[PDB]
C-alpha cells in the first residue's frame, strides 16, 4: 500500500532506474512520464553494479528522501551501507528477492511491500540481531536448518516491477494500453517459464484478460487505425516467428532442438516428412512468413496446433499478445524481447553501455521505432552465430564432466559475447546436444558451468550458472555453489554485479579454483 505514500510524493525525488535489466525501463518510463504528470522533474541513473551505487550516489550527498530501490536489497543492512540516512526514506520495488531482515526494520527509512503465505522466518531477528551460549548455538544452528537454508543454499526472484504500479494506476483514471504492453514486456522479460517461473501464467490467462476483456472503452466503434487495443490469442514464444522464414525457426529453435535433433540430418529429413503432413512447399518454407503467400500463412497455426500433437513436442501452445499501430505491421510482444538485447552492445568506446541504455529507453516509444529494426537484424545473426561454436563443439566434444556437474570452458572471446548473457544461452542450447542427446537423461540432468574468455578486459574469467532441466523451479545451488572455492581458498574474487550467480576470477587462477570447487 502506497495510496498513503504515493500522495506524499510531491517534494523532491529521484527515480533511480536500477542495474541492467529490461524490467527497469518497463517499470520506469511510465513514471518518467508520471513525474511531469504531477509536475515533477525526474532524475535517473545508469547502474551496472553495486560498483555504481555510491560512486554515483556519493556524488549526490543530499537528503532527497523519496527514493527508489529495484533489483537490489540483497546488498547490506542498508543503513550500514546507506549511512547518510538520518530519516531519509527509501521506497523499494525490487525483484532481487530473498532479502535479510536487517533491512526492513528501523521502520522509518524503508517500506515493506511484502505480504505472503509463507511465515517461516520470524525469529531471525530473535537469533542473529538478538544473539546460555550453548543453548544459544543450539537455537542458532538447529533453526539455521531453516535460516541458513535461506541465503546459504540458493536464491531466486519474485514478481513484477510496475504491475504494482499498474495496480495503483488503473484506479487513477489511466488506461495506457501501451503501458499494458510494457507490462507484457516485463512479463516475458523474466516471467516466461522458459526463463524464470510463473506457474500461475495459466491463471493470468484470466488476470490481464479480465482487466481488458472487461474493458473496451469503445466497445461498439473500435474500427480505427491508431492505438487499437490489444487482443489475446494462443500463440508461441518460438524464436522470432515473423520476419524470417519457417526454416529459420525450425533451425534456430531449441524446443525443436531438444526434442527433434535438428543440427544433424535426420532432423531435416524428419522435418521434411512433417512438412509433408502440413504439405507446405519448400520455397514457401524458406520465405519470410510476412513474405509468403497467404492461405498457408493464414492456416498455419490452425493446423500446427493440432497435428503437432503426436511428435515429441507437447508445449508449443502458449498465451500471448501482439499488435500494431496502423498499416505497416503487426508487431508481437515476444517478437521484441529478443530485439531488446541487441543494443546491449559491449563495444570498447566506454560510451556504448550507458548511452545504449539511453537509446533503449528511447526505444519503447511509438515515436522511436526505426532503430528496433536493426535490433531484429542483429538478433538473427546472433542466433546463427550461435552455431559458430555448437557443431564445432558438440561433435569435437569440448565437454568436461568434472564430477557432480558438467564442465565447459571456452578459451577465445567473441565481440558477440563481450555482452555477457550469451553465456547463459549457449549453455541452455547445447547441454541438450550431446550431454542430453546421445544418452539417457541420467547423464543429462545436472547443471553446467561456462567459461568466459575475456580477450578485451585483460583476462578475468567471467561466468554464469545453469540448472538441470525439466526440474527448473528447484532453485539454484549456484546461488551458493561458487562461494565454495571462494570460501575454501578465495582467489581474487568479486561479486561486483547485482546478481549472485556472477563472478570474476583471474585469467590464470581458475583451475585450482575448480579443484576446490569440484566438490
Amino acid at each position: 500500500l502506497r495510496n498513503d505514500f504515493y500522495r506524499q510524493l510531491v517534494g523532491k525525488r529521484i527515480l533511480i532506474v536500477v542495474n541492467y535489466d529490461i524490467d527497469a525501463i518497463c517499470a520506469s518510463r511510465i513514471l518518467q512520464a508520471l513525474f511531469k504528470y504531477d509536475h515533477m522533474l525526474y532524475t535517473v541513473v545508469p547502474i551496472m553494479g553495486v560498483t555504481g551505487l555510491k560512486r554515483a550516489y556519493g556524488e549526490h550527498q543530499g537528503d532527497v528522501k523519496y527514493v527508489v530501490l529495484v533489483n537490489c536489497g540483497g546488498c547490506v543492512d542498508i543503513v550500514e551501507l546507506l549511512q547518510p540516512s538520518d530519516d531519509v526514506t527509501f521506497f523499494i520495488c525490487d525483484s532481487h528477492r530473498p532479502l535479510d531482515v536487517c533491512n526492513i526494520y528501523s521502520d522509518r527509512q524503508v517500506c515493506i511491500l511484502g505480504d505472503a503465505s509463507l511465515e517461516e522466518n520470524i525469529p531471525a531477528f530473535e537469533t542473529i540481531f538478538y544473539d546460555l551460549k550453548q543453548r544459544a548455538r543450539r537455537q542458532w544452528e538447529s533453526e539455521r536448518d531453516r535460516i541458513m537454508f535461506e541465503y546459504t543454499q540458493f536464491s531466486y526472484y519474485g514478481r513484477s516491477a510496475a504491475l504494482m504500479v499498474f495496480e495503483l494506476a488503473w484506479k487513477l483514471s489511466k488506461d495506457n494500453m501501451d503501458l499494458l504492453w510494457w507490462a507484457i514486456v516485463g512479463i516475458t522479460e523474466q516471467l516466461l517459464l522458459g526463463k524464470i517461473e510463473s506457474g500461475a501464467y495459466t491463471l493470468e490467462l484470466e488476470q490481464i484478460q479480465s482487466h481488458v476483456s472487461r474493458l473496451t472503452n469503445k466497445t461498439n466503434d473500435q474500427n480505427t487505425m491508431s492505438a487499437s487495443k490489444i487482443t489475446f490469442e494462443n500463440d508461441l514464444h518460438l524464436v522470432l516467428y515473423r520476419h524470417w522464414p519457417v526454416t529459420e525457426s525450425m533451425r534456430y529453435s531449441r524446443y525443436s532442438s531438444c526434442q527433434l535433433k535438428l543440427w544433424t540430418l535426420r532432423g531435416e529429413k524428419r522435418l521434411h516428412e512433417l512438412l509433408l503432413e502440413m504439405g507446405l512447399p519448400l520455397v514457401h518454407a524458406r520465405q519470410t512468413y510476412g513474405a509468403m503467400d497467404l492461405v498457408l500463412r493464414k492456416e498455419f497455426f490452425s493446423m500446427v496446433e493440432r497435428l503437432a500433437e503426436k511428435y515429441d513436442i507437447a508445449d508449443i501452445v502458449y498465451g500471448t499478445f501482439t499488435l500494431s499501430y496502423g498499416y505497416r505491421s503487426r508487431y508481437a510482444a515476444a517478437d521484441y524481447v529478443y530485439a531488446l538485447l541487441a543494443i546491449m552492445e559491449s563495444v570498447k568506446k566506454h560510451k556504448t553501455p550507458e548511452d545504449c541504455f539511453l537509446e533503449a529507453s528511447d526505444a519503447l516509444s511509438r515515436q522511436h521505432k526505426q532503430l528496433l529494426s536493426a535490433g531484429i537484424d542483429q538478433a538473427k545473426l546472433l542466433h546463427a552465430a550461435v552455431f559458430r561454436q555448437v557443431q564445432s563443439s558438440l561433435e569435437a566434444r569440448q565437454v568436461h564432466s568434472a564430477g557432480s556437474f558438467f564442465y565447459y570452458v571456452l578459451q577465445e572471446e567473441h565481440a558477440f559475447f563481450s555482452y555477457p548473457y550469451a553465456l547463459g544461452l549457449l549453455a541452455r542450447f547445447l547441454l541438450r546436444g550431446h550431454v542430453a542427446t546421445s544418452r539417457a537423461r541420467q547423464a543429462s540432468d545436472l547443471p553446467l558451468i561456462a567459461s568466459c574468455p575475456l580477450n578485451a578486459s585483460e583476462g578475468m574469467c567471467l561466468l554464469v550458472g545453469i540448472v538441470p532441466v525439466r526440474e527448473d523451479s528447484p532453485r539454484n545451488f549456484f546461488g551458493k555453489a561458487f562461494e565454495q572455492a571462494a570460501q575454501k581458498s578465495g582467489v581474487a574474487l568479486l561479486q561486483d554485479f547485482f546478481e549472485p550467480a556472477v563472478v570474476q576470477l583471474r585469467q590464470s587462477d581458475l583451475t585450482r579454483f575448480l579443484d576446490s570447487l569440484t566438490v
Partner: protein, 571 residues
Amino acid sequence: NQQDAQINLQAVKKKYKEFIRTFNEENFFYKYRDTLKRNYLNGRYFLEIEMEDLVGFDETLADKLNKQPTEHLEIFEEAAREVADEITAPRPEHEEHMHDIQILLSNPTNIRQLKSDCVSKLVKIAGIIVAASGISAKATRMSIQCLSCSTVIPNLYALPRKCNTEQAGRPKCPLDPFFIMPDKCKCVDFQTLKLQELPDFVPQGEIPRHLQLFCDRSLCERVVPGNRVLIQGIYSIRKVGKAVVGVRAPYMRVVGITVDSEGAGAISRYTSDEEEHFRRMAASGDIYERLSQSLAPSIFGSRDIKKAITCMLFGGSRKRLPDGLCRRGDINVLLLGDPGTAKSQLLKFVEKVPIAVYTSGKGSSTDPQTRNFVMEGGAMVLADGGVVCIDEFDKMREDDRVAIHEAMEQQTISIAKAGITTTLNSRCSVLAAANSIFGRWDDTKGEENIDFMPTILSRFDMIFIVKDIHDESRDITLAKHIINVHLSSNKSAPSEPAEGEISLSTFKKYIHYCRTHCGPRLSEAPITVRQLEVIRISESLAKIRLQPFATDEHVNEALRLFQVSTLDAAM
C-alpha cells in the same frame, strides 16, 4: 460491370483511389498523396509504391493483384489520372491539359529457377547488367483516314474487312485503303535491357545463361553496364504455336527495379569536414617528403626518390599560347628493372590508389544486329585525365607500336579504317615498367635496352630503375620485410594511422581537388635542352607546395632526383 468478382471497375470505381485517399496518418505527413506533388516539382510523371502496404489494408487484393498486373497496373493508371487531375484546380479554373503517369513497385531469386509455372507473374531477383540498345519508339494510338478512329489497342487486329471508304452509295474499297496516319499518334520509349547471372551460381562446369528485358517510358537513361540490380518484371512471351513442335519466347519487362550502392567506389555517376581534413595537413609544409613514404603506403621502394611523383600526378600545366602550339602538359616518367621487387603488386595497387587499366602486351593494346558497324574506339577511353603504368613496351607487336608514337609525344590521333578522321587528344600519360636487358649494368653504358630505336629515350624524363641490389645490411631487412607482410596476409588497417601517408580515398579526393583548381605557374627563373624542355616541373611545384609560383632551383630538388637518373646518360 460484372460485379460479382473480377469486376472491371472496383479499383478505379472507388477502391484503389480510396486506398490512396486513405493512406493517411497524422502529422499531416503520412501520404501516398503529396508524393507526386514533389514529382510535379519538375514533371517527372511517376511514383513509387510497395508490395506490402495493400497487405496493410487487406489480404484479398495481394493475391488478386499479383496474378494479372497486366490489367491492374493500368487500372491503377486510370485511378491515378482521375484522382490527380482533380488537383490542377480546386474548381474548374486551371488546366492546360492532363498528361501521362507511372506507378512503381517496391525476397530475391535467380535465373535457373523460373519456368513454365512462373508465367504471367511478378518476381524479385538480382543480377549484373551487361549492355543494351538505344531509345527508339512506340506509341499507344493513332488513326487512319479511312475511318478516323483512335486505333484502340489492348497491348503495348489490323483492321479487318470493313473499309469505311465505303458509304458513298455503293462504290466499294475492299482490302484496306488504310494509310496509317502518325500525325495523329502517341509516343513512348524502349531500351531492351539485359542481365548476367551471378558469379556464385555454377557458371564453372556449365555455361552462364541469361535473358533479355524490355522497358517502356522513363526508366531508360537510368542504367549503363557494370552495375548490380534487383528487379521486378513479368515472365511473358512473343511467339505462337501448335518448332518441331513449339519452342518459343523468353523475355521479361520491367516494373520497378532497385539497384545497389556498393560501398565506397561509386563517386562515379549519380564534404567540407573533409576539406578541413584536407587543408590542416597542408597547413603543415611537410607533404613533399612525407608522402614520399605513402605512395607505397605499406612496403619499401623509391623511398628518397618517391618525391618525384609530387610533380606528375598534379602534373604541370597545359599552358596554351596565343600561337599554334598546345604545349606538353602531358609529361612522362619511367621505371625499369627485374622481378621480385614487388614491382608486379606495387603498380597493382596504383590502380587502387586515379583511373586506369593495368596489364602488359596482347592483353587494352590499332555485331550481328541492325546493320550498323560499331567501333568502340582507342586508348583515350579510360585515360584522358586517367593515366596508366604498364610493362612490355618492346615485348609487344610492332604493328601496334606506331600509335604510341602518335599517342604519346603528341596525341597525334587519326582514323583510317573507314573514311573519317577522329581528331582526338587527351590530358593523359603513361609510366613504363620493365624486365628488359641487364638493368643497372646497362643504364650507365649506352643505348640498347630496347633493341630497335634510339627514339625513346626521347620524350621521357626521370629514369628510375628497379633493382634487387645486393646489400647484405638490407638483405636481412627485406628478408624480414616479406614474411608477415605476406604472412597472416595482414597489412590492411594500420597504414591509415599515419599523419599524411594514409586514407587512399581521402587521397583520391585530395588530389582531385589539388590539381583540379587552375593552371598555376612559376616565378622568374648538366643543364641541356631536353632535360630542360623539367620546365614543366618548374610549373609543378605550385601544386606541390600549392603555391601560385616558385623559382628555378628550390624545385631543382627534382634535379637531385634527376641527376640520379643522369648517371645513366651522363657522358
